[PDB]
Every structure is written in C-alpha cells, then in structure tokens.
Amino acid sequence: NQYIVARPVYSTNAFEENHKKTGRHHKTFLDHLKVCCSCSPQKAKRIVLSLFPIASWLPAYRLKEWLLSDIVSGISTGIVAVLQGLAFALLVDIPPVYGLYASFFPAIIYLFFGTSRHISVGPFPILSMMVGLAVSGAVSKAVPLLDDERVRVAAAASVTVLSGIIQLAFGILRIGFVVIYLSESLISGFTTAAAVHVLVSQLKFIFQLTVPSHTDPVSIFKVLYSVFSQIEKTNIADLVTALIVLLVVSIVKEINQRFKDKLPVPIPIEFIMTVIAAGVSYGCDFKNRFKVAVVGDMNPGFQPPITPDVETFQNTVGDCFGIAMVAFAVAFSVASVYSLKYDYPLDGNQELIALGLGNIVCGVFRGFAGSTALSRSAVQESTGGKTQIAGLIGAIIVLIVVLAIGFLLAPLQKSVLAALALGNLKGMLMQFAEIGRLWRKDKYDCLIWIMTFIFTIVLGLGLGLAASVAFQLLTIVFRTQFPKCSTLANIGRTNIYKNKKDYYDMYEPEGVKIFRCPSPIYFANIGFFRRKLIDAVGFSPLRILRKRNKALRKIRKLQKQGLLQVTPKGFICTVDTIKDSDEELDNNQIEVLDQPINTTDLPFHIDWNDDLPLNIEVPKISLHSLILDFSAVSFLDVSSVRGLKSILQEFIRIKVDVYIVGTDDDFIEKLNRYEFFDGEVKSSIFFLTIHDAVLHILMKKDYSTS
C-alpha cells in the first residue's frame, strides 16, 4: 500500500481558478413557490390521491391473502378496544360509553384518511390522562351529580375538537416533521413518567376511593395523598379482584410473549378475564354483597352532535396544543415501527390530517381525544392485521357493543378495568433500565432522560413535555459549549496532523501554530474559542498590538524631538539619556492603540521581534503563521463571524498570517454573505488542507530568508 500524491499547493482561490466550476442555479423561492403552484392534471390527481389514501390501497386489495387475517385481527382488536375505551373513559372521569365513542369514530375516519396499515386508532392511557387534566382545568376556570358529568363530557368534547383542529392545521401547513424535535431519551423519560402517572391514577379504582379532580403542578403527589389518606376505607373486594385480574393478565401476557411460536393466535386474556369477572360479579351479586363499583347501565346508541364551547377553547388552547403534539408523536412512533417492519411509506403530514379529522369528528360526537396505543396496535398486528380493514372491523365490534350488547358490561367492576390498564404498563415501566445504559453511553442523553422524567412527574404531563423539550434543546448547547480545542502537530513528516499531546515524535514547524476547534462555533462558543486560541498561541494579539503602538508612539515622540535620528540602517540615538515617562493616554484617546501600525513614514521597516533602542520594551513573539483547522466547524452564526473577524484582524495587524483550512465551498460561499472578507482580510487565507497551508508557509519563509 502506498499513498503517493504529487500535485501543486492549492488555495481555494487557486483551485477554483485552475479547475473551472460548473455553474449551478441553486434555487430561489419565487420559482419554487410557482412550481409548487403548477396545478397540472397529473399533479392535482396526485394531491387528491395523497389526501385520500383509501382510493389507492382498497382497489389493490388482495382478498384471498388478506381478508381472513383482517377479519380475525379486527375481532381481536375490537374486543380489546371496547375494554380499553371503558378504562380510558374512567381515566377522563366521564361515563364509560364515551370511551366507546372514542374507540369508534377516529378508527372510522382514519380508515379513509390514514396512511398507516397496522396501528389501531383510539384512546391510550397517557392521552386520556392529559384530556382529563385539561377538562378538569377547564371546568375550574368557568365563569358561571349528573350536571357535573355533563359539564365534564362537554369539556372533553371541546378539548378534543380543539386538539384535532391543531393537528389538522399542522397537517395542512406541512409541518409533519415536528416529531424530530423529540429524542429517544426525551420520549423514554416522558413515557415512563406518564406510566407512573397512570399507575397513580388507577389507585382510586383498585381501592374504590373518592379522590378530587386535582390539577398540575405536582398533581401526582396530590393524588397520592388523597389516596393514602383514605387507605382505611379501601374496598377489599375491589382490591382482591384487581390483584387477581392483574396477576393472571400479566402471567398470560408473558406467556404470549414467550411462546409466540407454538401459539397460533395470542391468548385473549383480557377478554376472558372480563367475561369471568362480569359473570362472577353478576352471579354472586357483588354490587350489593360487597358494595363494589361497577360500570353500570350505559345508554344504547350514540349522542347527537355537540357544539364546541369557545370558552373551553380559550381556557385550554395550550393543553390542546400539548395533547395534539403527544398524540401525533405516539401515533407516528408506532406507525413508523410498523412501516419499517413491513416496508411501506408513511406520510407524516397525512397522519396529522387523518388524526385531526378523527379527533374533530370524535369531539363533535361527544368522544375524547385518542391517536394510537402501542398495546392495541400490537394486538392488531400480532393477530394478522394486514390492512386498515382490521380497524374497520374493530370499529364495527365497538358499534355492536354501543348499539346492542352494552348491557352485558353493566355488572363489570371498575377495578377490573383498572387492573387491565395497569397490566398494560410493564413495557413503559421497565424503561427505568435506560438510566444506567444512558449513563454508560451518553450522559447528555441520561440528563435528558432523568431531567425529562423529573419535569413530567413534578409538573404536569403537558407542561413537563414543554420544559423537557426546552431542556433537550439546551443540552445541544451543552454539548458544543466548551469544545475540546486542540493544537495540531505533524507526525511522520507527511500530510498527517494530529493532536500535539497525543503522540511521540511529532513536529511543529517553527513559527507555525495549527489550532482545531472540533465543533460548529456559534454564539455560545466564540468567547471560549478566543480564550482557547489565545492560550494556544501563547499571547493576546491585541495586547501585543497595543504595546507595539505604545512603543511606536514613544519612538515618534523621541525622534521628532531630535533625541533619535532616522537612518536607513537602524535606530541610531544621539543621546542615551531617556528618562522614565509614559504618555498616560486618557479614556478618550486610548482607542488609538488598536489601530494598524503604519510605519511607512520611516524609510526602513521596524523589526518588532528585535531589540528597540533606549530600552523600549515590547513583547517578542515567535508566531508568524496561524492555521485554523475548520474541518469540523459546521456553521458560523452572526456572532461567530463578528468574533472571528476581530480575532483575525488583530492577528493580521501584528503581522501574523492567518490560514483557514479544511472548509468546503459552501462554507466560503456563506462567509461571503456576512461581508467577512475585505481589505486586510481576503479570501487568499483559505487553503484546501492543513498540509497545503504548511507548504505555502514554508515556501514563503524560505523565499523571505533568501
């Protein structure tokens, strides 16, 4: 192997000069705006088919291969969705039939407007908790036992319509890329904190206690006190039934996860458990024997459309923003999992449009918000879900339960629903193991995780997410805050320049300094960059310039008085009796020491690194060439330019040639916009690589030696 290169030393200017560059009209936004408004027949059809995905996958339906799997997966997911809807309507503190409305309407709208094929659409615990908190805050700020739940149902419907409107607006404006602003560790900490929230929320149903509608901040600790202050009134039948259901459900769920091969269809343990619980609570008469809290009689049928309260809109706009963002984040994560697993495209913008429309229709018809539960999407995909016909059949099962056979869910206890909702928490609760992993790998992401979790538990579920996103954006600045700037030296007498402190037998060319900042320099970076550059070169260029200007002022004062005669050979002095005296420039003239040294008045050049007459003392420097390795400097903001240009100017003023190497052409094109280059700072300071600058320096210095 041999790396044999023989070419000329290239500046960026000399390179672009010798190699003619393909002229490219990069873009404007006028032509982009107009080409975005072409409205060709083919473009109009493409837009109308991207807004109505069912027109594309329904005619391409593979009946023989998909119909039975869709029917089976739909039966399973609908049976699960009925119970999940009842439980999550308990989480919202409304009658439990509105959970069935929330399980019915978004699935039917997403069947038409959605691009995913494997997610089940409906409520999930975190969003039901967020909606319950939003409506408990909306009923509080309201300028004035069945009226209470009626007002709560109205507030839930209005919160749902507003969050659906926000989602639909975000999908129309094509902002479907907001999901990138939530990292894996932020989502992890938020979801395990929310699982702890839900665990705490199910305690009033396991024990059958009466807990107020507490609100954030610190709602979880308020709910814990309300629960364990009454722990002497705990219903024992509710507790025992909930523990039995939770135990059996978790055992059979682990069995389903472990024996996923020998099992043809996963065991529907939730269905069996609720059937058995309702049968034993109806046969043994638990409602009057043990005084348990049961689901009770639900009204058959749907409710007429409702009108959204704009007062609730005003009172909960921010809560609905949080609800819309969490709903989209969760649904897009689950849908992305399945789209990567089955290799089909997933339009994020369409998701927002599909979920917003579903939430609007749901809230209009008295349901509450919901996008996708990973627990129900897994039940749908694991049972053979091939298309969104499984969602249609799940919604048909929900419709059958709403219209015909809801009376069977009358003797079912709320502790059983709470036990199921608690059984679905193992996956999120065991994410506490991410703390140690992230500690090992990346402590900024461990900070995001730990720091998200604390915010969400301490604050609310919607305020915690906002503070968490802000802190996660702050850790990006933490990463690039104190960069490990280094000094480079040549190792091997070749074109390899490494850290000066890392290898033996390196070589720094005399008078040359190579400095590397390993990160994008921004506003929070440039003071540190200047401090480290000054520590690396060994002096402050502005201080050297100021002392040189002081020395030049003293030389002029001593020479125009006659004590120092100018000669083209040197600084001969007729009298060597200089007395100690400083000019003591006042506050209004001291700014004259930062000006460039223009000593062309004297016929000969002053050597500032030699000794000056009459004991005038100036700090002597060895540096004559400063190379800046800008390879890993991705961007420069407005603050970086101002800071860098001023840094460069002082170096240039004290006669130190500055070279910037390792930058691509886009970097220099962007630097041309800041009006960075001028006289005394030109584009000739940019070279290709560190070696290119180093060979230029060597030839310059050997020619100056000649």
**Contact set with Cl ion (CB under 5 A):** 124, 373-375
Contact with a copy of itself (CB under 8 A): which of 46, 141, 260, 531? 260
Q: Are 40 and 362 spatial neighbours (Cβ–Cβ below 8 Å)?
A: no
- Figure out which of the listed residues 96, 125, 385, 411 binds a copy of itself, where binding follows CB under 8 A: 385
Q: Which is nearer to a copy of itself, 5 or 63 (CB)?
A: 5
Which of the listed partners (a copy of itself, Cl ion, none) does 374 bind, with a CB threshold of 5 to 8 Å by partner kind?
Cl ion
From residue 283 to residue 322, what is the string marking binding to a copy of itself with x (rule CB under 8 A)? ----------------------------------------
Distance CA 661, CA 691 (A): 9
Residue 195 token pair: 């699982």
Considering only residues 415 through 434, tell me which ones interact with a copy of itself, judged by CB under 8 A: none
Closer Cβ to a copy of itself, 214 or 645, answer by number: 645
What binding mask, one character per residue, do residues 151-190 give for a copy of itself by CB under 8 A, x or -? Answer: -----------------------------xxxxxx-----
Closer residue to a copy of itself in complex, CB, 150/441: 441
Residue 565, number of CB atoms within 10 A of its CB:
11
Q: Which residue lies nearer to a copy of itself by CB, 230 or 480?
A: 480
Which of a copy of itself, Cl ion, none binds 375 (CB below 5-8 Å, type-dependent)? Cl ion
The binder of a copy of itself chosen from 201, 382, 487, 490 (CB under 8 A):
382
676-705 positions binding a copy of itself, by CB under 8 A: 688, 691-692, 695-696, 699
673 is a contact residue toward a copy of itself (CB under 8 A): yes
Cα gap 82→376, rounded to integer Å: 11
The reply to whether 105 sits near a copy of itself by the rule CB under 8 A is no
Strand partners, 629: 516, 661
Q: Residue 373 binds which one of Cl ion, a copy of itself, none, with CB within 5 to 8 A depending on kind?
A: Cl ion
Q: Among residues 586 and 678, whose Cβ is nearest to a copy of itself? A: 586
What is the DSSP-derived secondary structure letter of residue 636?
B
Pairing of strands 486-491, 625-629: unpaired
Does 632 engage in binding with a copy of itself (CB under 8 A)?
A: yes
Long-range CB pairs of 605-612 (<8 Å, 24+ gap) are 606/552, 608/548, 608/551, 608/654, 608/655, 612/551, 612/555, 612/571
| Alpha-carbon distance values, 568 to 153, 199, 561, 598, 612 (Å) | 97, 90, 19, 17, 15
In the window 14-73, what residues touch a copy of itself (CB under 8 A)? 15, 19-22, 24, 65, 69
**CB neighbour list of residue 265: distance below 8 Å, 6 or more residues apart:** 72, 76, 383
- Torsion sign over Cα 476, 479, 485, 486: negative
Q: Which of 381, 442, 373, 445 is nearest to 195 (CA)?
A: 373
Binding of a copy of itself by 633 (CB under 8 A) = yes
Structure tokens that stand for 242 in this block: 């909930």
Collapsing DSSP states into helix, strand and coil, what is residue 687?
A: strand
Of the pair 438, 465, the CB lying nearest a copy of itself is at: 438
- In 3D, which of 503, 476, 477 has the Cα closest to residue 488? 503
Sole window of 157-165, 290-298, 309-317, 380-388 interacting with a copy of itself (rule: CB under 8 A): 380-388
Return the structure tokens found at 122: 């409906």
Question: Which residue reads 């999407």 in tokens?
Answer: 377
**Residue 662 touches a copy of itself, criterion: CB under 8 A:** yes
Backbone angles phi, psi at 74, to 5 degrees: -70, -40
Minimum CB separation from a copy of itself for residue 670, in Å? 9
Q: Which is nearer to a copy of itself, 262 or 605 (CB)?
A: 262
Please identify, among the stretches 238-246, 454-462, 521-529, 608-616, the one whose residues bind a copy of itself according to the rule CB under 8 A: 521-529
Measured from the CB atom, the residue of 282 and 444 that comes closer to a copy of itself is 444
